[PDB]
Design a protein around this nucleic acid. Structure first.
Ligand code: NA
Lengths: 71, 73
DNA sequence: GCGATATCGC
DNA sequence: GCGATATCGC
């Protein structure tokens, strides 16, 4: 099993912000959540927390890649 | 990424076999809804025994598969 | 990961 | 507790 690609900083945030978006948009569609998630993401000026996490997730992915390639 | 895949539970064997059925009975049903629906059918199923035997047999093939894999140590 | 259900302890 | 096990976009 080849490692799945790492979660992006965008997706890391979205996972954490999905209930919030749904609370503020009752009955909202998965498709519309994505569009909304993008509005909030483009608006969020300080993405440091998510960029920091995506950075480590990248490192983890790299290590899983290392382990998958050599044995 | 080479050892035997863990054997499937009675519920997963049933769902895998019923998925396409559930999907055609609810056109467009999403996977999360197929799962939701799976839980419903499973909690209500009168007799799981056939599914449990299949799960038990999958476990046996698995335990066997694991002995072969660890046979040379 | 998560959403959506449900087991099992390589 | 959680990832694996199925599924499968996001
Ligand atoms: Na249950």
């Amino acid at each position: 099993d080849k490692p799945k690609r790492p979660l992006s900083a965008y997706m890391l945030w979205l996972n954490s912000a999905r209930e919030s978006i749904k609370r503020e948009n009752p009955g909202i569609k998965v498709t519309e959540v994505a569009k909304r998630g993008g509005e909030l993401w483009r608006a969020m000026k300080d993405k440091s927390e998510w960029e920091a996490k995506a950075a480590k997730a990248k490192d983890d992915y790299d290590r899983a890649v290392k382990e998958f390639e050599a044995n």
